[PDB]
């Protein structure tokens, strides 16, 4: 604890019943930081918090906190000998003392979660499989994967037009930089049965919201190519092919290519089009077409073309093509609670149900997705988000927080002229009649997932066949 000869990562376990003292300095030991506890008292005093508050002036950092003997890294094997306080409230003298001999305290229990589970708001109000499914699906959510995406020639990349930070957030996301590169949009979710097009894990989206850019994304796809001069026997070269010299020329037109054989940026390209005109010298004479076509049925625009030399040093070309993906029926969307579903139908703003103040939901999800799944975090997030949007906040959905429960959120929401439980009177968009049931509606953070239907739809009728067995190809 003094940063003397023993470094911080050294584990020192005393098994008492068996008289071993096992000291470990090797690598690969997973450990975590914990607050040391005096007799029944944190060593972390207000002086440490004060110095930490001005961390940017007096260069008082974490590593001084460790050097002060206030924090300690404990490995899994040494936890067996440690008596942990979940919070400093456990250190507090009680009518019946549970332990009274604690040695360490959690900094915060929410640090048991990882990167993707630290995104979930109110994860302790969900069934745990739902938290696992979200931790999986946050990795398929679109956003801005990195700030310098304009210069990266990634094979596949999805960028959301209008990423938003969640209105209801956890205090862990401040370190995941989710606020700075968020992967979703706050959507006005109504949980309702409306026309039957959201049944069995499906959603009804607002066509008008989609027209305004709601969950619109851009898909970037990069195509490689290189002209190999491996030997005088045969050499490839980028050049606009010609019908008179090239042998394996498809019937697709090559007019979009330039002299150099490379399409130019800003050119609209449809499926089966040519972006690189490459010809290889033969042993329809003395050169055969080996051009690069678009991956079929894409219909994008050439975002940019880069030319350079590879390691060995022949020409090398990268072409990024850009395709705007507007959400549509069959695109998969998810909240942060394992509630995934495809778009069942899109209604225009006049067809959607509306509140007395003409707010239509961006998304309508079916109430039958809640009861078996027990994703109460979804409902609490919706209610907290209504409070946050009406109050001008960002809600605190950190997992284990006794200063935030459903009652106090409901009391807050009732102060803004809303039903305290997040229900509203909606009117049928088609007829204008009030719906007899008051619908639960509010802001919820939704995610657009990589799984778009246009990348999955496929059909065949007498296409190509495999060489070995003359059967249809795969994929």
């Amino acid at each position: 604890r003094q940063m003397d000869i023993i470094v911080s990562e050294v584990s020192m376990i005393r098994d008492i019943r068996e008289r071993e003292i096992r000291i470990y300095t090797d690598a690969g030991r997973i450990c975590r930081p914990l607050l040391i506890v005096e007799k029944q008292k944190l060593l972390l005093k207000k002086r440490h918090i004060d110095q930490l508050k001005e961390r940017e002036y007096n260069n008082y950092s974490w590593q001084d906190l460790v050097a002060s003997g206030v924090v300690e890294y404990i490995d899994t094997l040494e936890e067996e000998t440690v008596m942990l306080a979940m919070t400093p409230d456990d250190l507090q003298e009680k009518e019946v003392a549970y332990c009274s001999t604690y040695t360490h305290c959690e900094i915060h229990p929410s640090m048991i979660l990882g990167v993707c589970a630290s995104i979930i708001p109110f994860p302790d109000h969900n069934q745990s499989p739902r938290n696992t499914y979200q931790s999986a699906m946050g990795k398929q959510a679109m956003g801005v994967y990195i700030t310098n995406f304009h210069v990266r020639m990634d094979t596949l990349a999805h960028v959301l037009y209008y990423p938003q930070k969640p209105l209801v957030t956890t205090r862990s996301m401040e370190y995941l930089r989710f606020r700075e590169l968020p992967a979703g949009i706050n959507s006005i979710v109504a949980i309702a049965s409306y026309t039957g097009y959201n049944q069995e894990d499906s959603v009804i989206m607002n066509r008008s919201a989609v027209d305004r850019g709601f969950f619109r994304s851009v898909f970037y796809r990069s195509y490689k190519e290189q002209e190999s001069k491996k030997g005088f026997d045969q050499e490839e070269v980028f050049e606009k092919p010609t019908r008179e010299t090239c042998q394996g020329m498809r019937h697709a037109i090559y007019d979009k290519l330039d002299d150099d054989g490379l399409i130019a940026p800003g050119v609209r390209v449809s499926g089966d089009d040519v972006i690189i005109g490459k010809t290889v010298t033969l042993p329809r004479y003395t050169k055969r077409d080996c051009s690069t076509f678009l991956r079929t049925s894409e219909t994008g625009i050439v975002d940019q073309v880069m030319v350079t030399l590879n390691q060995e040093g022949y020409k090398f070309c990268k072409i990024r093509v850009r395709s705007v993906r507007i959400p549509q029926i069959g695109d998969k969307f998810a909240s942060r609670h394992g509630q995934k579903g495809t778009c069942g139908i899109q209604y225009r703003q006049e067809d959607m149900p509306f509140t007395c103040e003409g707010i239509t939901p961006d998304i309508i999800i079916n109430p039958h997705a809640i009861p078996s799944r027990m994703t109460i975090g979804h409902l609490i997030e919706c209610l907290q988000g209504k409070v946050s949007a009406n109050k001008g906040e960002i809600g605190d959905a950190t997992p284990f927080n006794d200063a935030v429960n459903v009652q106090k959120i409901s009391n807050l929401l009732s102060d803004y002229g809303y039903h305290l439980r997040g229900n509203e009177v909606l009117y049928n968009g088609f007829t204008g009649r009030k719906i007899t049931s008051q619908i639960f509606i509010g802001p919820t953070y939704y995610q657009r997932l990589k799984h778009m239907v246009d990348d999955k739809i496929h059909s065949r009728a007498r296409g190509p066949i495999q060489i070995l067995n003359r059967q249809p190809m795969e994929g």
């Binding site: 026309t195 097009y197 139908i345 067809d351 968009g429 088609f430 007829t431 246009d454 739809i457």
Partner: protein, 115 residues
């Protein structure tokens, strides 16, 4: 890939007509009006105005499929009346209502702006 143009919902294709009238052989004095490239906006008002006619025995409408852009309006009247005549009178009454509403809204604006 499969997105219809947004104009398809309201524009008419060549050779397909706005409204088609079909006996309903179910019951006497009933007709089905298949109206193309309209939606709940006209269907609901026509149906409610028809329900105001005491000579109309049945008035209903449906959008058979939201992805399709037609409505069906079924009108059954009393034997001395006609569903075509009922439909015509309903449209005439809606037009007169909207003309009166427009004139009165103009007057109400007139008054609000000057007092």
């Amino acid at each position: 890939m499969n997105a219809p143009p947004a104009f398809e919902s309201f524009l008419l294709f060549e050779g397909e007509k706005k409204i088609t009238i079909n006996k309903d052989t179910k019951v006497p004095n009933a007709c089905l009006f298949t109206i193309n490239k309209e939606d709940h906006t006209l269907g609901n008002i026509i149906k409610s105005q028809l329900l105001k006619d005491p000579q109309v025995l049945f008035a209903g409408y449906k959008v058979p499929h939201p992805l399709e852009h037609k409505i069906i309006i079924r009108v059954q009247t009393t034997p001395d009346y006609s569903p075509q005549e009922a439909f015509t009178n309903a449209i005439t009454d809606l037009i007169s209502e909207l003309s009166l509403l427009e004139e009165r809204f103009r007057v109400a604006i007139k008054d609000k702006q000057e007092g």
